[PDB]
Design a protein around this nucleic acid. Structure first.
Lengths: 482, 752, 748
RNA sequence: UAUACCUCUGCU
RNA sequence: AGUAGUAACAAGAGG
């Protein structure tokens, strides 16, 4: 090594090497490339921990009784606004589950809520509830030497997920997540006094966001998830053995400026002796909803729905009575998942930073605070949706909510598939942008990337929707370009 | 109308709106069970990429060791371990010409460092594999347990204190035929009340040469949790305590090289890296002519660790150090040698379930050799059959390939030398190149006259890379004209653009303590406003959301608000009792003082003006029991894990209040057989606690001394008591007491 | 201190720990101090969310059981007897901390703000700091290294460690005496500051370590780089906005001296391009305000000996010292002058380096510290150096500094070891200071490479040898020792000096001292913020800002300028808004670069069909200068930004000037300047590219082989050929038969 | 063996 | 059942 002196060894040994070792550049063109192969099979299921568009609000105007601070006394006040309870009747079967238990759990819940007094409610350990929360379902741990020769002893099912097909419900969920409502869901904590001129402009600009965000339906889901998960983590640590009831609450303010407390349903917690972050607490989601499950049967594949009551609703013209459905579902969440559920409020920043950067991008070149002439001077000049006519453009306020909804749905439908897809699709997105910048782009192995992208797209509804959105973008480029 | 956010990219460029592509607001993917399945796959791929290499069996280890270096040249684009020593030695020579005297000055700095550095230094860092207890332990304890056995045996050169003297013992420790090691053991008993109670004791066990040497060259394995930008999980690794000491100096040598290299992306930090990149692009346009096509390839190397062979690193070290003293060459050469003959422990093992019986069971990693293949599935049992060939003392020998990010710095030096080869004057072709390398990721920039010349160049790079075990990922990488690129998640579009979504995970409760988290969370917003272009209003929001996150997390809701939590009862008592409401810290249910301008001031110092003299007295009482000062260098240091990064310790500015408290330790070690290590710690910490009464300085600067702790304290006590006698305010009878006590202690020392 | 020895007696009584106290050494104690069964927290954000739900999450010292009650007034349990894992500490409730703060023991904290002074200063700077208006524009940030630690006492970590040790642990210092007088003062200052202050010494050490030592980082800064302004980077600047602000307390004198030089230099460099420079300089001088204080009153009071500053002082009629500093010592030119030629040279370290070499005979008078000399210097040649001082150390230190100042090939080719002329982040460094700091640490290689000379035996003029000997026969080449020193004070005397229209500085005798050519064009960033309130200067200066503001203003008023380009173009060329751009162009090229442009603009007017508004906007500011008629081809124009020669290509997009057709916007230096109208525009014919030529689409093999731009001279009028134009593009070109020309409306 | 309680642990 | 996805949780350990 000390005595070595080079004699073109690289230059000689390069020529001796085979010509099959090479990095050939396949010139990239968006019009030449194909679309993403979406996976085929059964239709995809609603995997979220609570109901998004379909949920029903049993609301109460303003404070009442010693509740408000106390969680169950909010739910008691919310239940008293509805008087139309039938005897429970199963109308959509959870195909794999023993559906008699789901009816008994709701009846035991509604019985226990009536009979309870005080602040907290631990349900009694009954064999129908034990099934729903998975009592004793853990096999007992033993030494290998104690049970060597057992016939069916195998490792745990170390297999890939079952492939699913894209459905229309996930797109509609996003459409509805993007929309506005009459309730300001987000409430911000206090701030310091605005002394610096920039802090006044920042507040003025923050007020336009505050309106556009707080009124969005995505915020309703954020506040829901935050409450569910914050309450669930605190219960999971303190009440490890007890089957606690946790209501689904979101306190809001109307566009009039009046207070309101909405109730969506109940969550019965299971045993929460959580070793690692990934270890699960099984819970039973019981949620109110007006939508019929038999019209879109694939969406609710894991749910068991009960027709529990009836109520009056006033249409724009008519006044039509309808039945209420209680969507019951055995589910499970982990410390890591509910922890990130607690921190969902940061979804606003991903949107608002991106919106603010687009405002500040124009502000610099225009030499003026473009804050007000973006929101106030309404112009449809950002492509955010695709209708039967073509590609519809929207405003900075629409962009805010559209980008918020994505940020929320990324948090709700959080998975390895999304994580893997997002990283690899970005490379193709960057190639399209490098072509559209006119930088003569190229790839060493295009179809190898496609395989790495398509490997990720398996069963997650959100990943499947993003994968379709990528194709919708890809075609939308191709049509506009050539 | 159907909504589609990715349509934004029609109007807005992808780089300018790159934040929307990262879905980092949700939870990351965690690996649930054991990494044994992934480890074996890594072990198999490493040997599979080196398959055409020459096998051999080790004289001491008795392990099958595959030797691909100087093997047959590969004739396909698949990943290859078949590197060529004469090419590497030409690259390293080519680096030395292009950077004259660089190796000399870098070596001379390492020479000083070796003679200078203490054993104390090796306590710093991430968890290492403690061969004493056959598991991962914190770096400090691994060292202490290694020194325990070393000193219990004949190897006590480390008593000097200097690192080089400890490294002397490490090589001698292989000469012991039967290495005596003490290990914990459980023991049942019967104690009345009648209770059957257990207690833990000691057990002397001897390890033969095979048993020791294989444990010294063991790298432990785990799974990489929370790894974003990926689908399937990964298998990370952890080094032994013997090899650890040498790697430090080899990385330190490499660092001194890399710091001075134009094309090195390490060890520089965030903005410094962004500057160092942005400058080489301007350097390239300075170097090139007007009538040249410049193409920037956004590189990424496939299986970076598994291809590059520790025999190549031995060649690199020996060639870089050529000219220096033979002790220094040999000393640095140790780590490549230890890596080249290494073994790999295969995690915890596997878990079986029985559907009919309804029972589960954990099987050991050592039992993978002695077990029927009916239990495992086709993919697994195929791997078990493969791993049995490499199995020695219950561990698989990974002779070829590097395990994980260990030699990063020196690994970069190999990649830089290829970028160095691309100089116009060195090549003398129609094409030439320059760029940047930082371990696995790299950015190349080729220049020529026609795209023929660029293609010619890219091949000359790619094939030269292959010749030395660098393997470009043809899937992930992509080329375009110079103007846009990506590099370690920094996105360049005629200039580096903001990627805010990368930092989002930091915007929350850090989880250290009330006083710290406030200082962190506010500085997180501050720093993101400068670097990552967090706009004023969104920054204002970030404060409002962080405060609300902070209140809910620590249960320190503002005193007036009517929420039901354990603390609010005691917080109300303060809130009502306090005169000035703005004086109260948020941690004690006060108001949020912060806004854009205030972010750089600590809460305590900010509210000092508005504070209540009674409050600020109690809050900042130095005699409180909540704070726990240990050492100056560790003071005001939290630990935070970002989205893309290994592990970071962050500094924070805050006043030493009662809110600077430490939370409870994990108490699961009470149940297990390591129960004594808790008791040892009580003795060790309280032994230092008493020493620190005699020598206060030890908390600031490390106490340097070869003499005994007792002997140091006794010598201090005698002289302190005499200085307090003669000039000071202590009586002759009080002096006598001390000296007589010291004399008694001196006897009680000698009696045992 | 009897408690501790009685505690140690009881420690030694136990056999298990007397083992540890005797066996483990004082070196090895640092290992067992950090010995713990617990390991570092992996996800603390989660673990705190988890633990704060628990009843007793916090740990605290065993003596908490003494200090606070077990059950609090409202009926919450404050502490328990269950101990923490491997500690004497006990698990307690967060109600304990809340209890302590309302009901616990009150403690004196009058000395607290002196320990944390570093933090409290930040509140003082914000409280007494003043706000101004918000400007909205493309904030051109620059990645530079700056100070993060305002109010530091300039010390290294080693220097500060001694000082801290002597304050907090005076009894247990090693052998290290406080070497510097700065240390000795600070040690006494900080001792009386924190006298009888009850607080943990550990905290004081940390606070003093952070307070004393300089701490720096790489940040993106636009304009002000002083530590008091870096402190509030988040508040001062953004992506598109500049919040005007000046913090409380008086600024540093070195920074005010530094920024003055930059301001003066910018004002001088701006004035050279304008007509009637003296009046422009006077106009700028009265308007300019450094950190809310007019430049004129600062120039009167400041003692800063600098060329560009002395030009400003001469216009305002202030006392002037014709001098400039270098490596501590000040240099005053007595006789002669030199042109500042730019010629690249190889070092002895084998590194190519573009240097600004000073070519011409000059006699300098030199002084400072404990030394002084008379230097006589030419183009890379030290003729003579008569040095004198108090110590041989300071004489030799100056000798080295002068031997560096000479720029001889002798010293350059004796550079040994490692010495890069670029930063750890590949930034261009000052070579002269790098050489100086290298050679002041390592002299031996220079001295032996320098050579010796025979001395005339004169009683007074001694010789200095290459081993530092005071020899009377031999000496170093040109170096002479003055045994009685050198007479001085006449050096320091501030002269009454005159100035002409074109900023040449004439002494009362009637001879030139300082010329605008001598002023260095070192486009450096400023410590304190300069505010030029002039129409001549832009809102904020700095070479990168000039390119963006110049091209932005063209696009801003493009409809006015486009009509002015077609009809009456000479007024468009001689507009005063294009002057600040000319400072970016090299002084030699300015004339030929404008001439090359004007003809390409008239070629565009002559030929029908070809009209590229992008090509006009790109090249428009280069036109604003009296043109030269010399026919030479240019593939690109060079521009000096912070020393770095950035090349703007004539045809197509460039690094400097880019037009992204996707965005439809001009990106200057990675910053959007504006959108222009190009629907009907664009053709295969290109006029404004080559002088007396027209590009006609892509190349055609049946007009011979491709050619370079240099080969265009050998072609007939009307004839065609293939040319490799730029960025690897081969295009068909035709030599047009007609020519074009314009007469200017200006003088000399 | 089975059902009760009772003890430790929630990153080890 | 359910979470979950290449391997686990559905408490673990002890009288």
């Amino acid at each position: 090594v000390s005595s070595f002196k080079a004699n073109g060894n690289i230059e000689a040994k390069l020529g001796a090497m085979s010509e099959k070792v090479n990095a050939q550049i396949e010139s990239f063109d968006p019009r030449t490339i194909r679309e993403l192969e979406l996976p085929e099979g059964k239709f995809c299921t609603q995997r979220s921990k609570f109901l998004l568009m379909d949920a029903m609000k049993l609301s109460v105007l303003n404070p009442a009784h010693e509740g408000e601070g106390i969680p169950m006394k909010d739910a008691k006040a919310c239940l008293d606004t509805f008087w139309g309870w039938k005897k429970a009747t199963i109308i959509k079967k959870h195909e794999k589950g023993v559906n008699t238990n789901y009816l008994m759990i709701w009846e035991q819940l509604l019985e226990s809520i009536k009979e309870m007094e005080g602040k907290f409610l631990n349900l009694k350990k009954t064999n129908h509830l034990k099934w729903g929360l998975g009592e004793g379902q853990a096999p007992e741990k033993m030494d290998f030497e104690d049970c060597k020769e057992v016939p069916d002893l195998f490792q745990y099912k170390s297999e890939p997920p079952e492939k699913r097909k894209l459905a229309s419900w996930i797109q509609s969920e996003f459409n509805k997540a993007s929309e506005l409502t009459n309730s300001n869901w987000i409430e911000f904590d206090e701030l310091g006094n605005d002394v610096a001129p920039i802090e006044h402009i920042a507040s003025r600009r923050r007020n336009f966001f505050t309106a556009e965000v707080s009124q969005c339906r995505a915020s309703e889901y954020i506040m829901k998830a935050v409450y569910i998960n914050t309450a669930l983590l605190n219960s999971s640590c303190t009440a490890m053995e007890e089957y606690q009831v946790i209501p689904i609450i979101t306190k809001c303010r109307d566009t009039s400026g009046q207070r309101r407390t909405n109730l969506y349903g109940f969550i019965i917690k299971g045993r929460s002796h959580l070793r690692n972050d990934t270890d699960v607490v099984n819970f039973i989601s019981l949620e109110f909803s007006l939508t019929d499950p038999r019209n879109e049967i694939h969406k609710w594949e894991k749910y068991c729905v009960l027709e529990i009551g009836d109520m009056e609703i006033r249409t724009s013209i008519s006044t039509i009575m309808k039945p209420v459905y209680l969507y019951v579902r055995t589910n499970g969440t982990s410390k890591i998942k509910m922890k990130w559920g607690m921190e969902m409020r940061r979804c606003l920043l991903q949107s608002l930073q991106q919106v603010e950067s687009m405002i500040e991008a124009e502000s610099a070149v225009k030499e003026k605070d473009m804050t007000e002439p973006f929101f106030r001077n309404r112009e449809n000049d950002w492509p955010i949706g695709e209708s039967p006519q073509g590609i519809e453009k929207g405003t900075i306020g629409k962009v805010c909510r559209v980008l918020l909804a994505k940020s929320v749905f990324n948090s709700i439908y959080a998975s390895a598939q999304l994580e893997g897809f997002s990283a690899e699709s970005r490379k193709l997105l960057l190639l399209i942008q490098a072509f559209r910048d006119n930088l003569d782009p190229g790839t060493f192995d295009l179809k190898g990337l496609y395989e790495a992208i398509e490997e990720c797209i398996i069963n997650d509804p959100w990943v499947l929707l993003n994968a379709s959105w990528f194709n919708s973008f890809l075609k939308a480029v191709q049509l506009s370009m050539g | 109308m159907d909504v589609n956010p990715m349509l934004i990219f029609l109007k807005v460029p992808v780089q300018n709106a790159i934040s929307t592509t990262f879905p980092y607001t949700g939870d990351p993917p965690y690996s649930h069970g054991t990494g044994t399945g992934y480890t074996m796959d890594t072990v198999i791929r490493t040997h599979d990429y080196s398959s055409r290499g020459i096998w051999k069996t080790n004289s001491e280890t008795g392990a099958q060791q595959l030797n691909p270096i100087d093997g047959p040249l590969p004739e396909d684009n698949e990943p290859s371990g078949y590197a060529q020593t004469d090419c590497v030695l030409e690259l390293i020579e080519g680096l030395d010409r292009s950077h004259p005297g660089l190796f000399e000055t870098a070596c001379q700095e390492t020479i000083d460092a070796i003679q200078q550095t203490r054993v104390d230094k090796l306590t710093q860092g991430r968890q290492t594999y403690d061969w004493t207890l056959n598991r991962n332990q914190p770096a400090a304890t691994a060292l202490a347990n290694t020194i325990e056995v070393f000193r219990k045996n004949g190897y006590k050169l480390n008593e000097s204190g200097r690192l080089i003297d400890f490294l002397k013992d490490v090589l001698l420790s292989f000469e012991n035929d039967s290495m005596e090691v003490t290990t914990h053991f459980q023991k049942k008993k019967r104690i009345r009340d009648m209770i059957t109670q257990r207690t833990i004791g000691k057990k002397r066990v001897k390890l033969t040469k095979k048993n020791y040497l294989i444990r010294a060259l063991t790298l432990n394995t785990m799974t990489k949790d929370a790894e974003r930008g990926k689908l399937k999980r990964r298998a990370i690794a952890t080094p032994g305590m013997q090899i650890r000491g040498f790697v430090y100096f080899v990385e330190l040598l490499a660092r001194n090289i890399c710091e001075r290299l134009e094309q090195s992306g390490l060890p520089v930090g965030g903005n410094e890296k962004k500057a160092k990149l942005a400058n080489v692009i301007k350097k390239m346009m300075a170097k090139s002519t007007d009538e040249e096509l410049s193409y920037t390839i956004t590189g990424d190397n496939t299986k970076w660790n598994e291809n590059q062979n520790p025999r190549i690193f031995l060649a690199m070290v020996l060639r870089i150090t050529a000219g220096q003293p033979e002790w220094f060459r040999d000393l640095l050469a140790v780590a490549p040698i230890m890596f080249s003959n290494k073994v790999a422990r295969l995690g915890r093992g596997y878990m079986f379930e029985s559907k009919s019986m309804h029972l589960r069971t954990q099987i050991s990693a050592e039992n993978l050799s002695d077990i029927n293949l009916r239990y495992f599935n086709e993919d697994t049992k195929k791997k078990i059959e493969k791993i049995r060939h490499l199995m020695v003392e219950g561990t698989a020998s990974l002779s070829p390939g590097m395990m994980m990010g260990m030699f990063n710095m020196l690994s970069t030096v190999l990649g830089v030398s290829v970028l160095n080869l691309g100089q116009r004057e060195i090549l003398k072709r129609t094409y030439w190149w320059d760029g940047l390398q930082s371990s696995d990721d790299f950015a190349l920039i080729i220049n020529g006259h026609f795209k023929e010349d660029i293609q010619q160049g890219v091949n000359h790079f790619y094939r030269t890379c292959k010749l030395v075990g660098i393997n470009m990922s043809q899937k992930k990488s992509y080329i375009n004209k110079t103007g846009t690129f990506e590099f370690t998640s920094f996105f360049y579009r005629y200039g580096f653009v903001a990627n805010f979504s990368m930092e989002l995970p930091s915007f929350g409760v850090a989880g250290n303590n009330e006083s710290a988290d406030m200082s962190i969370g506010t500085t997180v917003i501050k720093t993101n406003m400068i670097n990552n272009d967090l706009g004023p209003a969104t920054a204002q929001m970030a404060i409002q959301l962080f405060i609300k996150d902070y209140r809910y997390t620590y249960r320190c809701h503002r005193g007036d608000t009517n929420l039901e939590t354990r603390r609010t009862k005691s917080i109300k008592r303060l809130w009502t009792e306090t005169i000035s409401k703005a004086g109260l810290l948020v941690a004690d249910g006060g108001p949020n003082p912060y806004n854009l301008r205030n972010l750089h001031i600590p809460e305590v110092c900010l509210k000092w003006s508005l504070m209540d003299p009674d409050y600020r007295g109690r809050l900042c009482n130095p005699n409180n029991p909540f704070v726990h000062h240990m050492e100056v260098e560790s003071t005001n240091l939290a630990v935070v894990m970002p989205a893309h990064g290994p592990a970071k310790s962050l500094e924070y500015d805050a006043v030493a209040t009662t809110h600077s408290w430490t939370p409870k330790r994990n108490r699961s070690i009470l149940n297990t057989n390591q129960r004594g290590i808790l008791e040892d710690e009580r003795i060790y910490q309280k032994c230092c606690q008493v020493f620190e009464k005699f020598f206060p300085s030890s908390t600031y600067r490390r106490p340097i001394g070869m003499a005994s702790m007792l002997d140091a304290m006794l010598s201090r006590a005698r002289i302190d008591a005499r200085i307090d006698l003669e000039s000071g305010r202590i009586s002759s009878q009080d002096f006598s007491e001390i000296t007589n006590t010291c004399k008694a202690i001196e006897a009680l020392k000698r009696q045992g | 201190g009897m408690e501790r020895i009685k505690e140690l007696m009881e420690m030694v009584k136990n056999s298990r720990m007397r083992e540890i106290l005797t066996t483990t050494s004082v070196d090895h104690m640092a290992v067992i101090k950090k010995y713990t069964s617990g390991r570092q927290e992996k996800n603390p954000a989660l673990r705190m969310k988890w633990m704060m739900a628990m009843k007793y999450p916090i740990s605290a010292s065993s003596r908490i059981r003494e200090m606070i009650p077990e059950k609090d007034e409202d009926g919450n349990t404050l502490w328990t007897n269950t101990k923490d894992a491997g500690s004497n500490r006990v698990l307690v409730s967060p109600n304990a901390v809340t209890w302590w703060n309302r009901a616990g023991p009150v403690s004196d904290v009058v000395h607290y703000p002196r320990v944390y002074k570093m933090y409290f200063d930040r509140l003082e700077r914000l409280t007494h700091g003043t706000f101004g208006p918000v400007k909205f524009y493309n904030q051109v940030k620059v990645r530079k290294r700056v100070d993060i630690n305002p109010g530091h006492k300039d010390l290294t970590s080693r220097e500060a460690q001694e000082v801290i040790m002597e304050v907090v642990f005076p009894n247990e210092v090693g052998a290290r005496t406080l070497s510097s007088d700065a240390q000795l003062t600070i040690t006494k200052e900080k001792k009386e500051e924190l006298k009888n202050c009850k607080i943990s010494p550990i905290m004081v050490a940390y606070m003093l370590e952070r307070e004393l030592v300089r701490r720096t980082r790489f940040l993106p800064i636009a304009g002000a780089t002083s530590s008091t302004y870096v402190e509030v980077l988040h508040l001062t600047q953004g992506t598109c906005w500049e919040q005007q602000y000046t913090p409380g307390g008086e600024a540093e004198n070195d920074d005010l001296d530094q920024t003055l030089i930059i301001a003066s230099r910018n004002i001088v460099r701006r004035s050279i391009v304008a007509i009637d420079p003296l009046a422009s300089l006077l106009s700028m001088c009265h308007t300019t305000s450094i950190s809310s204080e007019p430049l004129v009153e600062i120039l009167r009071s400041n003692p800063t000996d600098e060329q560009a500053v002395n030009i400003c002082k001469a216009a305002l009629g202030i006392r002037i010292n014709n001098s400039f500093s270098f490596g501590g010592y000040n240099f005053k030119r007595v006789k002669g002058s030199s042109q500042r030629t730019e010629k690249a040279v190889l070092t002895g370290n084998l590194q190519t380096l573009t240097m600004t070499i000073f070519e011409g005979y000059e006699e300098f008078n030199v002084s400072g510290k404990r030394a002084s000399a008379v230097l006589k210097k030419g183009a890379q040649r030290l003729i003579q150096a008569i040095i004198g001082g108090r110590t041989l150390e300071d004489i030799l230190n100056l000798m080295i500094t002068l031997m560096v100042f000479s720029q001889e090939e002798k010293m350059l080719k004796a550079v040994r070891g490692d010495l890069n002329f670029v930063n750890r982040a590949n930034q261009r460094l000052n070579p002269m200071y790098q050489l100086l700091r290298h050679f002041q640490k390592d002299s031996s290689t220079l001295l032996k490479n320098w050579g010796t000379e025979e001395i005339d035996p004169i009683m007074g003029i001694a010789g200095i040898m290459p081993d530092g000997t005071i020899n009377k026969t031999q000496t170093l080449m040109g170096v002479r020792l003055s045994q009685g020193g050198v007479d001085e004070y006449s050096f320091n005397e501030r002269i009454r000096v005159n100035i002409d229209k074109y900023l040449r500085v004439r002494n009362e005798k009637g001879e030139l001292l300082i010329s605008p050519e001598e002023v260095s064009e070192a486009q450096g960033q400023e410590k304190l913020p300069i505010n030029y309130n002039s129409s001549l200067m832009w809102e904020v200066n700095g070479p990168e800002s000039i390119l963006t503001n110049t091209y932005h203003w063209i696009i801003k008023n493009w409809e006015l300028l486009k009509t002015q380009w077609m009809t009456d173009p000479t007024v468009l060329y001689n507009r005063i808004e294009f002057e600040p751009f000319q400072t970016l162009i090299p002084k030699g090229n300015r004339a030929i670069y404008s001439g090359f442009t004007r003809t390409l603009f008239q070629q565009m007017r002559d030929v029908e069909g070809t009209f590229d508004s992008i090509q006009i906007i790109k090249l428009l500011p280069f036109s604003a200068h009296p043109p030269s008629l010399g026919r030479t081809q240019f593939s690109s124009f060079t521009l000096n930004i912070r020393g770095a020669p950035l090349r703007l290509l004539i045809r197509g997009n460039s690094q400097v000037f880019n037009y992204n057709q996707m965005e439809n916007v001009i990106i200057v230096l990675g910053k959007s300047v504006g959108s222009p109208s190009i629907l009907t525009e664009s053709s295969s014919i290109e006029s404004a590219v080559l002088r007396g030529f027209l590009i006609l689409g892509k190349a055609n093999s049946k007009y011979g082989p491709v050619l370079t731009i240099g080969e265009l001279d050998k072609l007939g009028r009307g004839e065609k050929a293939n040319v490799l134009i730029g960025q690897g593009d081969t295009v068909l070109v035709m030599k047009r038969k007609r020519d074009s020309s314009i007469l200017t409306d200006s003088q000399t």
